[PDB]
RNA sequence: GAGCUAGCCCUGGCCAGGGUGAAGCUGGGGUGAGACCCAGUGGAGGCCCGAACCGGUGGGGGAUGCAAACCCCUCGGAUGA
RNA sequence: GAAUGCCGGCAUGAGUAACGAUAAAGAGGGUGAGAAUCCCUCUCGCCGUAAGCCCAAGGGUUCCUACGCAAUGGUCGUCAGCGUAGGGUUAGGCGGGACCUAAGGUGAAGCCGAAAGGCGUAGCCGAAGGGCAGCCGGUUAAUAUUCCGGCCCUUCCCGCAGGUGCGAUGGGGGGACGCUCUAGGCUAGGGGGACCGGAGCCAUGGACGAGCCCGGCCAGAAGCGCAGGGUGGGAGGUAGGCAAAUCCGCCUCCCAACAAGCUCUGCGUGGUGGGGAAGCCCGGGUGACAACCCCCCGAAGCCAGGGAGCCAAGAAAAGCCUCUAAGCACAACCUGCGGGAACCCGUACCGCAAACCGACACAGGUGGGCGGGUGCAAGAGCACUCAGGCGCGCGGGAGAACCCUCGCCAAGGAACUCUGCAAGUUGGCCCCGUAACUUCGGGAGAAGGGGUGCUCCCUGGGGUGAUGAGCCCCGGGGAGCCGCAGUGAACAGGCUCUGGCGACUGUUUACCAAAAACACAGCUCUCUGCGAACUCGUAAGAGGAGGUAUAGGGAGCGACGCUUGCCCGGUGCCGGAAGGUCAAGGGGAGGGGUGCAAGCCCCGAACCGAAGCCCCGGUGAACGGCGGCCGUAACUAUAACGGUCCUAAGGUAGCGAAAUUCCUUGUCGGGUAAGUUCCGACCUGCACGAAAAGCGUAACGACCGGAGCGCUGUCUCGGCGAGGGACCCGGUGAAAUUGAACUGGCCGUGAAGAUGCGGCCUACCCGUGGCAGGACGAAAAGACCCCGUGGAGCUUUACUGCAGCC
RNA sequence: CGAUGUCGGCUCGUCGCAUCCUGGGGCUGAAGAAGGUCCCAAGGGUUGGGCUGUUCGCCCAUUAAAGCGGCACGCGAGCUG
RNA sequence: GUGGGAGAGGGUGGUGGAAUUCCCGGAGUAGCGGUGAAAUGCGCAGAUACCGGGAGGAACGCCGAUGGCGAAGGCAGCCACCUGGUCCACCCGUGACGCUGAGGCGCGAAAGCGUGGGGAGCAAACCGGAUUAGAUACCCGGGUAGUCCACGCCCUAAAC
RNA sequence: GCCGAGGGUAGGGCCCGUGACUGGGGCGAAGUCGUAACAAGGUAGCUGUACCGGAAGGUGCGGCUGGAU
RNA sequence: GCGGGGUGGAGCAGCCUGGUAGCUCGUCGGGCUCAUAACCCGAAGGUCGUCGGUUCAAAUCCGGCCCCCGCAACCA
């Protein structure tokens, strides 16, 4: 669901908020949080190197388990579902029967009070983790690793899912969230199901201030600048671009491909994306 | 109105002070020249 | 040289008083169940009026100035980007 | 002798402007060579959410006292933040260090870079954050939570007694956290008292009174009481918290659970220790054996880590508790008691300012806490006033013009002017009432109107009490009094209709532009499979992001509604194992130099040979583009229709004399007595047009137009009045400028606008207040223009390079 | 060009006369009244408002008339902007 | 009520194969396609035609009928669950509890709209080729909404 | 002193007349353009809706027979 | 001021590179039709805006004048 407001202020009229119904615990688990070093988009030189960043809400970072092959065969109960400010997706607090506690990103359908497990033998049900080779071809999956033991890299954002297409030797064939068709190694762990909070994309920020809370400062158009600042700078009155639309740094910005052609992972991408 | 000089001892000693100058090639060079010119003070007096 | 100024980072602080009255909740009505309507409760908001505080709209004065940007009247924001 | 030359000296303007907030002064007395200016008294005025008081920064002896007045002080000076001298800052508990970590800084390991140096998990540094033990009074010319008095507390060392598996930089718990709102109960602070204490007062017509005036508390261990915070207890298993672990985590079980218990804190009481007014005698004495009580109001502070709701989801580390490991268990630790021990640095004074930042004793700037009373609906607003502090370091007169700030105005009422610019008007609360349109919130304080003081009588609900009295809060009804006037002073909207532009709150050219500009939610295109793209850096390393296509970069458009047409020939980008061209390289037909020679050396055709370009295709919310001439309809006029030429394709909807329309005040309509503007229309649109978006849109606007009501010194058209200047007298005393000057009018002349030449005319010498026509007045080596083979910023299919990428 | 401030308005005017009015005349296709046209005359006078930045012009209502020009297109050490 | 029946009646969740399209490997050569005839188009950069692999969406051939079901709109592979109407036999139960129906409320083909998916085939708009006096059509090659899914709107019909 | 004809101020409601200009409608007709419908009307017609075109109309989707053979 | 242009009735070629005037429509005569259109068959008409010059010869090259289209007209 998504919550609307009555138009009692001009900005409320459009603003929509998340429904937060799946949340059962309004406090992060202390032994799993640590402080987020805000950067402002500035690097170790101090330079802005990603423009327009800063001034958002303070955040405590939740330590997530992107391995899971860490604890094969030890089951865990789903103790709660929590809000995580560092992602789109929601999180799930697991209490292992081991006694150890961990977070994973919360799949859609997960129940508070159910059980999950990881390993070659896990039942193919929501929340379990297996090497890709043992998940049946055709079932949809998330939190997928890209190389074995390297951590879950793909399908991590709310509502996303990858899907297994077929197999070819040591490798399985995934259709990624973007529609790209890729070979991933069969020993790459993955978690059955899709990520939850799929209603995320229907959120209407509603006013300038909301973006500000998110730590996103205002973006200024090239066309509004001067030639020193930007290719689109200057001109008397408004002006069309007057050259191929360009970035602040001059490269072409409508259409121009930038993936390195000789990149070694090319042997593994079957079909570049779509749409 | 608010003018440009707004004194601050910690600001001062950290910015222009002897240990600041010593750490870097530019600062050392300053001390050299101020010593060769015969300046009485190599570094801004500031009481702490 | 960022003790002015601009942005960000860490850690503290501040915003008299009044007004309007969102959702929610409770009760009543309504219906097969509902949608919903009414009342009370409630206290939302880059909401309203206005001090501090932050500004600098119009006018006047000032013009070897009280001042290398000030003064008076008036005016904008004032829980928020 | 000139360089707007350089350094210095001294003139001119000139006894002129000015002497720094218009809060304001007067007299008496004293001191002294000298007094408007120092001290004292009395009177008057000003601040009081300060113009009072206390902290932090910064300043660094400015503090106190004595003795001084050359200079500093905008005048004066006997005074001083000034000169000379002497004195003055006292801590285990306040602040910082011998504690902790934050961004950041530094940096063993390690990585990188010609050198210099750049990075870097641990650690270390880093505070106005965490942590940690002192409260009230007295004393000094000057210090005080520091000395003294009283009552309290902390750590460290040693000893004694009891107790326990003791022991850590290692495990764990805790510390530990947002915003808004908010309960109960307290405290701080305040109001009243017919009650308690008090020197005294009875005026001037009255009052010897339940009269006036003054004051009625502060700190305090254990114990206790009231209000709150924190926290389940036991057992069994246990593969997790990088060793171990009785701890913590997980599972099962029994008792308990809005309780109690245990513990911590606030507030009250409390052994005791202090304070203690008005008034009148010289800071002190007295008041005084001072009293030290009841009631009400009441926090934003406290109990606190309290409670609730919301989304944007809200530091770390140590102290502290606990668990064990090496070890050690004659040790060690915990608890109680005692004795001993407890270092370094700050402390003076200013601190919204004459002591800080502004060259000044400068109308500016400067963070935190306290900030009393009454009244006005509230309040930190406003008027007055307490405590406290001031009258702003030139004065005395006069009563011109003119200036500033302010007050009022007959009749008119925007006729003023680019413009109602400015100034009137309106103005708080209560009640009645309120339109188009609308996104159903709004528009709305629309508009418009009534009420408002005081006195008496009657009555309703609430708080604290007790259910009552009293005190406090919120009302209702009736009858009357006075004035021109009752939010009687002060603070406190003028309104309406109608267009443009931007949806909106926001942002901007510090110091001539606040806007229609920027941003903005929202829409689209496009890149990116993650050692992402992209950005910074030679690199290492970083940001991106401890994110992962519902995510991140780039670009345009800019809520929302309805929409966004046709063109891919050129440019861009995308796709294209062909063909063409294509560098180094391979290859070596053939040729050359030299040697007696094998040999050495040089040129070198075909053919093989990347990206790029060519070439084939796609693509517009990619750069961009979206025709001409001629004819045609029962009269005209016009052209639905037709002809032909050209193109990659010939502007669709909607809009249109427009923020766009040249001709132009187009034409017509509306409004006005009259309208180059404004609104509504028409369309031969000089030169709209669809995300450099098109046409609309409620709400919003210190934006820019047009109109009307209200009301006004804006105007007819000016008048009078107030104060601060201007004027005069005493005191102090500048400035730009200045070739020298004994510096008149006219008509002429002159390098073409003459005080200075000619002719004539006029004119006794010198000042003062005034006005601005001239001295091509002052100021600025014209900012426009041109010139210089002068410079700088910006552009690109100018040239040539370089990084970057292929 | 080591600076001669620039439209219009306001304010204050002063001058020329090729006279808008008022005074004196000649001619008239001058009956009267009222005009036309030229001559003399610069003494005085020559309004208020709508539009526009406007000068100008147009318009409204009046008038004896609503004159045209010069003075650095008079006048910014006089104001507006 | 008791006991039975037929059915594409409705909702949810699954799942089967035929075919079209695109992609991949093979093999193969000079045309394929389309119409009245043609052109556009596609094709030596290797098409069509053929074999194998794979991806995805939509619609269910034979059964199929002059049939069945629903109040209407309408409903067609198959499987399970949930659910409605309706007929029959017995003559057991209630005892007129009935009929209709202004307003109301719900349902309501296609197209259309909102937010999000999905997109193989088809196809308004649009482009191109033909035809023609013209051809903003009929015919041919391309092609976007949409056609499909979820939720929410619209409420019209030669809804017969 | 109350009520009070009505006068005055302010804002609303319904109706009527009128208005530059504009939208289609009826009639007139001896005009221009095409030929959509009636025959299989030369693409069967009609239909709701949607997009488009000088105009009748066309096309998509679904529907009806009130469709010749 | 710079560039382009005038050719049967309409609209375009030919001009550069001198000798030679072409294309579609339209007009006229015939045909098909009851008739008209369309369609089919034949056919007329430009002395190339003018005046001048170069040449053996000028629509063509050069000059003058005329009319038309486009662009420019800036600091001021
Ligand atoms: Mg949900
Ligand atoms: Mg909403
Ligand atoms: Mg709401
Ligand atoms: Mg709602
Ligand atoms: Mg609103
Ligand atoms: Mg709004
Ligand atoms: Mg969300
Ligand atoms: Mg959210
Ligand atoms: Mg949720
Ligand atoms: Mg932690
Ligand atoms: Mg972090
Ligand atoms: Mg660093
Ligand atoms: Mg650095
Ligand atoms: Mg960036
Ligand atoms: Mg940034
Ligand atoms: Mg989350
Ligand atoms: Mg969004
Ligand atoms: Mg955030
Ligand atoms: Mg954004
Ligand atoms: Mg922007
Ligand atoms: Mg701009
Ligand atoms: Mg700009
Ligand atoms: Mg720069
Ligand atoms: Mg550049
Ligand atoms: Mg550039
Ligand atoms: Mg540009
Ligand atoms: Mg520009
Ligand atoms: Mg310009
Ligand atoms: Mg610009
Ligand atoms: Mg422009
Ligand atoms: Mg611009
Ligand atoms: Mg524009
Ligand atoms: Mg431009
Ligand atoms: Mg552009
Ligand atoms: Mg441009
Ligand atoms: Mg361009
Ligand atoms: Mg990879
Ligand atoms: Mg500062
Ligand atoms: Mg400091
Ligand atoms: Mg400091
Ligand atoms: Mg500092
Ligand atoms: Mg230093
Ligand atoms: Mg020395
Ligand atoms: Mg130095
Ligand atoms: Mg902080
Ligand atoms: Mg505030
Ligand atoms: Mg609630
Ligand atoms: Mg705000
Ligand atoms: Mg507000
Ligand atoms: Mg407000
Ligand atoms: Mg101002
Ligand atoms: Mg004003
Ligand atoms: Mg002021
Ligand atoms: Mg306000
Ligand atoms: Mg507010
Ligand atoms: Mg807030
Ligand atoms: Mg000389
Ligand atoms: Mg000089
Ligand atoms: Mg000089
Ligand atoms: Mg000199
Ligand atoms: Mg000099
Ligand atoms: Mg003088
Ligand atoms: Mg002065
Ligand atoms: Mg003074
Ligand atoms: Mg004053
Ligand atoms: Mg004196
Ligand atoms: Mg004296
Ligand atoms: Mg004195
Ligand atoms: Mg007060
Ligand atoms: Mg100093
Ligand atoms: Mg002192
Ligand atoms: Mg002296
Ligand atoms: Mg002095
Ligand atoms: Mg002074
Ligand atoms: Mg003396
Ligand atoms: Mg002094
Ligand atoms: Mg002590
Ligand atoms: Mg020590
Ligand atoms: Mg430290
Ligand atoms: Mg500290
Ligand atoms: Mg104490
Ligand atoms: Mg002392
Ligand atoms: Mg013992
Ligand atoms: Mg420990
Ligand atoms: Mg935390
Ligand atoms: Mg904190
Ligand atoms: Mg009180
Ligand atoms: Mg007290
Ligand atoms: Mg109590
Ligand atoms: Mg264990
Ligand atoms: Mg106590
Ligand atoms: Mg006393
Ligand atoms: Mg005594
Ligand atoms: Mg006694
Ligand atoms: Mg929290
Ligand atoms: Mg840390
Ligand atoms: Mg041992
Ligand atoms: Mg113990
Ligand atoms: Mg020491
Ligand atoms: Mg010390
Ligand atoms: Mg001290
Ligand atoms: Mg002082
Ligand atoms: Mg101040
Ligand atoms: Mg202060
Ligand atoms: Mg002070
Ligand atoms: Mg200064
Ligand atoms: Mg300075
Ligand atoms: Mg200075
Ligand atoms: Mg000073
Ligand atoms: Mg002073
Ligand atoms: Mg001052
Ligand atoms: Mg008041
Ligand atoms: Mg008030
Ligand atoms: Mg105020
Ligand atoms: Mg008082
Ligand atoms: Mg004074
Ligand atoms: Mg005088
Ligand atoms: Mg008057
Ligand atoms: Mg009026
Ligand atoms: Mg009036
Ligand atoms: Mg106006
Ligand atoms: Mg007022
Ligand atoms: Mg209205
Ligand atoms: Mg409404
Ligand atoms: Mg209104
Ligand atoms: Mg009274
Ligand atoms: Mg009064
Ligand atoms: Mg006042
Ligand atoms: Mg107001
Ligand atoms: Mg209006
Ligand atoms: Mg306009
Ligand atoms: Mg607009
Ligand atoms: Mg704007
Ligand atoms: Mg705006
Ligand atoms: Mg809008
Ligand atoms: Mg805005
Ligand atoms: Mg605001
Ligand atoms: Mg500026
Ligand atoms: Mg500015
Ligand atoms: Mg400046
Ligand atoms: Mg500036
Ligand atoms: Mg500005
Ligand atoms: Mg503004
Ligand atoms: Mg801007
Ligand atoms: Mg903008
Ligand atoms: Mg939009
Ligand atoms: Mg680089
Ligand atoms: Mg790195
Ligand atoms: Mg990171
Ligand atoms: Mg990311
Ligand atoms: Mg906007
Ligand atoms: Mg913008
Ligand atoms: Mg609308
Ligand atoms: Mg078109
Ligand atoms: Mg193109
Ligand atoms: Mg192209
Ligand atoms: Mg281009
Ligand atoms: Mg182009
Ligand atoms: Mg464009
Ligand atoms: Mg005709
Ligand atoms: Mg027009
Ligand atoms: Mg317009
Ligand atoms: Mg235009
Ligand atoms: Mg015009
Ligand atoms: Mg014009
Ligand atoms: Mg005119
Ligand atoms: Mg006119
Ligand atoms: Mg106007
Ligand atoms: Mg016209
Ligand atoms: Mg643009
Ligand atoms: Mg605004
Ligand atoms: Mg505005
Ligand atoms: Mg006046
Ligand atoms: Mg007066
Ligand atoms: Mg006066
Ligand atoms: Mg005298
Ligand atoms: Mg002389
Ligand atoms: Mg002259
Ligand atoms: Mg001269
Ligand atoms: Mg002369
Ligand atoms: Mg003379
Ligand atoms: Mg002479
Ligand atoms: Mg004379
Ligand atoms: Mg003068
Ligand atoms: Mg003057
Ligand atoms: Mg002069
Ligand atoms: Mg002169
Ligand atoms: Mg002059
Ligand atoms: Mg000057
Ligand atoms: Mg100057
Ligand atoms: Mg020079
Ligand atoms: Mg010069
Ligand atoms: Mg200059
Ligand atoms: Mg110059
Ligand atoms: Mg020039
Ligand atoms: Mg040159
Ligand atoms: Mg030269
Ligand atoms: Mg240059
Ligand atoms: Mg690149
Ligand atoms: Mg000049
Ligand atoms: Mg000069
Ligand atoms: Mg000058
Ligand atoms: Mg007569
Ligand atoms: Mg005569
Ligand atoms: Mg005269
Ligand atoms: Mg005269
Ligand atoms: Mg005018
Ligand atoms: Mg004019
Ligand atoms: Mg003149
Ligand atoms: Mg002038
Ligand atoms: Mg001026
Ligand atoms: Mg002027
Ligand atoms: Mg001058
Ligand atoms: Mg002058
Ligand atoms: Mg003046
Ligand atoms: Mg101006
Ligand atoms: Mg071949
Ligand atoms: Mg329907
Ligand atoms: Mg549809
Ligand atoms: Mg039928
Ligand atoms: Mg009457
Ligand atoms: Mg037909
Ligand atoms: Mg037909
Ligand atoms: Mg047409
Ligand atoms: Mg069509
Ligand atoms: Mg049907
Ligand atoms: Mg040619
Ligand atoms: Mg030829
Ligand atoms: Mg015929
Ligand atoms: Mg010849
Ligand atoms: Mg010839
Ligand atoms: Mg010839």
UniProtKB/Swiss-Prot annotation, chain A:
InterPro entries: NA-bd_OB-fold, Rib_uL2_dom2, Ribosomal_uL2, Ribosomal_uL2_bac/org-type, Ribosomal_uL2_C, Ribosomal_uL2_CS, Ribosomal_uL2_dom3, Ribosomal_uL2_RNA-bd_dom. The keyword Cytoplasm does not apply. The keyword Ribonucleoprotein applies. GO terms for molecular function: rRNA binding; structural constituent of ribosome; transferase activity. It comes from the Bacteria. GO terms for biological process: cytoplasmic translation. Pfam families: Ribosomal_L2, Ribosomal_L2_C. Residues 222-275 are annotated as: Disordered. Residues 256-275 have a biased composition (Basic residues). Keywords: Ribonucleoprotein, Ribosomal protein, RNA-binding, rRNA-binding. One of its GO terms (cellular component) is large ribosomal subunit. Residues 229-239 have a biased composition (Basic and acidic residues). Transmembrane segments: none annotated. HAMAP family: Ribosomal_uL2_B (MF_01320_B). Part of the 50S ribosomal subunit. Forms a bridge to the 30S subunit in the 70S ribosome, contacting the 16S rRNA. May also make transient contacts with protein S6 during translation in the 70S ribosome. Belongs to the universal ribosomal protein uL2 family. One of the primary rRNA binding proteins. Required for association of the 30S and 50S subunits to form the 70S ribosome, for tRNA binding and peptide bond formation. It has been suggested to have peptidyltransferase activity; this is somewhat controversial. Makes several contacts with the 16S rRNA (forming bridge B7b) in the 70S ribosome. This is Large ribosomal subunit protein uL2. It comes from Thermus thermophilus (strain ATCC 27634 / DSM 579 / HB8). The gene is rplB.
From Swiss-Prot, chain B:
Disulfide bonds: none annotated. Residues 29-48 have a biased composition (Basic residues). One of its GO terms (biological process) is translation. Keywords: Ribonucleoprotein, Ribosomal protein. The keyword Ribonucleoprotein applies. Signal peptide: none annotated. GO terms for cellular component: ribonucleoprotein complex; ribosome. PROSITE patterns: RIBOSOMAL_L34 (PS00784). Residues 26-48 are annotated as: Disordered. GO terms for molecular function: structural constituent of ribosome. The keyword Ribosomal protein applies. PANTHER family: LARGE RIBOSOMAL SUBUNIT PROTEIN BL34M, MITOCHONDRIAL RIBOSOMAL PROTEIN 34 FAMILY MEMBER. Found on the solvent side of the large subunit. Part of the 50S ribosomal subunit. Belongs to the bacterial ribosomal protein bL34 family. The open reading frame (ORF) for this protein is entirely within the ORF for the RNase P protein (RnaP). The two start codons are separated by four nucleotides. This is Large ribosomal subunit protein bL34. It comes from Thermus thermophilus (strain ATCC 27634 / DSM 579 / HB8). The gene is rpmH.
């Amino acid at each position: 669901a998504v919550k609307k407001f009555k138009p009692y202020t001009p900005s409320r009229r459009f603003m929509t908020v998340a429904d937060f119904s799946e949340i059962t615990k309004t406090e992060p688990e202390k032994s799993l949080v640590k402080p987020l070093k805000k950067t402002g988009g500035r690097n170790n030189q101090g330079r802005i190197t990603v423009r327009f960043r800063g001034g958002g809400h303070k955040r405590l970072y939740r330590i997530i388990d992107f391995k899971r092959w860490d604890k094969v065969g030890i089951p865990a109960k789903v103790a709660a579902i929590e809000y995580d400010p560092n992602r789109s997706a929601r999180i799930a607090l697991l209490h292992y029967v081991d006694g150890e506690k961990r977070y994973i990103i919360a799949p859609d359908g997960l129940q508070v009070g159910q059980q999950v497990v990881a390993g070659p033998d896990a039942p193919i049900q929501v929340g379990n983790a297996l090497p890709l080779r043992f998940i049946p071809v055709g079932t949809v999956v998330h939190a997928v690793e890209l190389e074995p033991k390297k951590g879950a890299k793909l399908a991590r954002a709310a509502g996303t899912s990858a899907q297994i297409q077929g197999r070819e030797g040591d490798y399985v064939i995934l259709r990624l969230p973007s529609g790209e068709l890729r070979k991933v190694h069969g020993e790459c762990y993955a978690t059955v199901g899709a990520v939850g909070n799929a209603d995320h994309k229907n959120i209407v920020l509603g006013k300038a201030g909301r973006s500000r809370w998110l730590g996103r400062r205002p973006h200024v158009r090239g066309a509004a600048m001067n030639p020193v600042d930007h290719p689109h700078g200057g001109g008397e009155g408004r002006a069309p671009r007057g050259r191929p639309p360009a970035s602040p740094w001059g490269w072409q910005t409508k259409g121009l491909k930038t993936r390195k052609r000789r990149k070694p992972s090319s042997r593994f991408i079957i079909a570049r994306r779509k749409k | 109105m608010k003018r440009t000089w707004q004194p601050n001892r910690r600001k001062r000693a950290k910015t222009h002070g002897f240990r600041a100058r010593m750490r870097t090639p530019g600062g050392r060079k300053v001390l050299k020249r101020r010593r060769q010119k015969g300046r009485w003070r190599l570094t801004p007096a500031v009481r702490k």
